[PDB]
Design a protein around this ligand. Structure first.
Ligand SMILES: [Ca+2]
Length: 525
């Protein structure tokens, strides 16, 4: 009997935020799935939202699938390059397109980020029912600033732009909050389904992405929890990750890098507003979890949960960006926020606040990894992941087997009994997956879907990484790194701390060869 699929994606969720991944945040629904299922510690996305999402729905690399760089950063020197179209292109077929022709009902509620135009929406790319925020982010409550020439570029590119199927929405309902609206819509779609056939349900939240906003009654639950700051938090998370066996007891955490003032150097007002941002974030995660519970509990009561392959992942590392630090997100973002929002302590988290938590809170969640979102180090690309499907033998454990987002499409086609069509689909040439199906591994037949010779590449925002087995080389340009290849043995040094470039030039050499083939195979510019 063919399984259902429930693929749930958090937006900028960090590695140890969820209870079953070492966190203090209340996530009882996700915990129950994770502990019963398989937690992954070596599962990888890309370093940003739309690249990852392009891969998750294709089984190939973002440079092929249309998100060679993020759309919001395309220049005229890249526009025209194949795979840099700025949206999911027609050089790929998506997973829902393939399941839909094989009898699955394809259902989505959440953030898309794969295209703004009609012919690029979920309805156009294989979803029969969809309720979607098309851009990368937006106000969770739908409160919009004035849009004119003087509006910061980062706000202009994040309107609350929603579609349902083919209808671009004029207005949002009363009481709209993103995670609740997504929960509501996917539950509706599930209740209205044809019960004699399986479904592919896609639940990409916009939480916990900035602006950090959540229901006050949930924020209140975290009052005072983060008063000790982000370095005290990082220590609690590291200890708990070791206690749970998610990281080995000897692991050396990468040092925290930040241009901001450390907690103890902050004035009391500043501290209070930063802790409140973290209390808000925690509420965002809890309320996402609560909506997940609504979906999952419905399926359970229907007797469908055990027949549903449930995959949860974040889409990249925790978000450490200072949005004020990027002039191109302006002109003056902070002044505009100061004149149009209220970020006073007591308003933070509500519709007319606009905050992000910054590098220090972000690195508490990525530890022991190096850095955070938009870096090709482990901090930006190693994300929490779980699989709950009791029809698979490998459940109840923590697995450190290498995996990536590109493995999802081939795994789900496999379970559906559906063959990838090859190099041609709907009269056009298409790419075949670069990932590998997880079926043998999760069946207990092999110990991993990949091996010591597997080669995987990353490149975005000028950064690079190239990995074979557990050897990884990384390239961070100025001002963020030495603008040279650094080499790491991930099996001994997960924090990417000890550069082996000089002591293992032969291994670096080979990885640089692999990197050239990566660029060549996928069209990296
Ligand atoms: Ca993201």
């Amino acid at each position: 009997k063919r399984p259902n699929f429930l693929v749930i994606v958090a937006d900028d969720l960090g590695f140890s935020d969820i209870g079953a991944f070492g966190g203090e945040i209340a996530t009882p629904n996700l915990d129950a799935l994770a502990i019963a299922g398989l937690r992954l510690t070596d599962f990888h996305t890309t370093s940003a939202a739309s690249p990852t999402r392009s891969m998750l729905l294709t089984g190939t690399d973002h440079h092929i699938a249309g998100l060679g760089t993020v759309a919001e950063a395309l220049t005229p020197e890249l526009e025209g390059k194949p795979g840099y179209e700025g949206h999911l292109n027609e050089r790929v077929v998506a997973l829902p397109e393939l399941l839909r022709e094989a009898g699955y009902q394809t259902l989505m509620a959440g953030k898309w980020h794969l295209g703004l135009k009609p012919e690029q929406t979920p309805h156009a790319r294989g979803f029969e029912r969809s309720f979607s925020l098309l851009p990368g982010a937006a106000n969770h409550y739908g409160f919009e600033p004035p849009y004119d020439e003087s509006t910061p570029r980062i706000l202009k590119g994040t309107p609350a732009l929603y579609v349902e199927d083919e209808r671009y929405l004029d207005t949002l309902p009363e009481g709209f909050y993103s995670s609740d609206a997504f929960g509501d819509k996917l539950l509706q779609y599930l209740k209205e389904r044809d019960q004699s056939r399986p479904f592919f349900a896609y639940l990409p939240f916009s939480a916990p992405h900035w602006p950090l906003q959540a229901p006050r009654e949930i924020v209140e639950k975290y009052r005072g929890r983060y008063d000790a700051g982000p370095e005290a938090l990082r220590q609690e998370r590291l200890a708990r990750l070791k206690e749970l066996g998610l990281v080995e007891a000897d692991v050396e955490a990468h040092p925290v890098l930040a241009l901001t003032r450390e907690w103890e150097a902050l004035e009391d007002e500043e501290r209070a507003k930063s802790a409140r941002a973290m209390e808000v974030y925690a509420a965002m995660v809890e309320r996402m979890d609560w909506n997940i519970g609504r979906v999952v509990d419905y399926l359970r009561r229907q007797g469908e949960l055990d027949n549903t392959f449930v995959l949860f992942m974040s889409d990249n590392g925790a978000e450490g960006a200072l949005l004020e630090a990027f002039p191109k997100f302006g002109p003056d973002l902070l002044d505009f926020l100061d004149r149009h929002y209220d970020n006073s302590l007591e308003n933070i988290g509500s519709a007319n606040s606009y905050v992000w938590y910054g590098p220090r809170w972000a690195q508490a969640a990525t530890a022991p990894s190096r850095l955070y979102k938009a870096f090709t180090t482990q901090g930006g690309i190693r994300v929490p992941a779980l699989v709950r499907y009791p029809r698979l033998s490998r459940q109840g454990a923590i697995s450190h087997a290498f995996a990536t987002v590109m493995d999802v499409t081939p795994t789900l086609l496999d379970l559906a009994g559906v063959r990838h069509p090859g190099k041609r689909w709907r009269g056009r040439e298409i790419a075949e997956p670069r990932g590998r199906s997880w079926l043998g591994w999760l069946s207990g037949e092999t110990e991993a879907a990949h091996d010591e010779n597997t080669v995987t590449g990353w490149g975005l925002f000028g950064m690079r990484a190239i990995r074979q087995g557990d050897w990884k080389a990384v390239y961070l340009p100025a001002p963020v790194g030495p603008a040279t290849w650094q080499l790491y043995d991930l099996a001994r040094d997960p924090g990417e701390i000890h550069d082996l470039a000089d002591s293992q030039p032969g291994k670096l050499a080979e990885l640089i060869e692999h990197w050239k083939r990566y660029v060549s195979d996928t069209g990296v510019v």
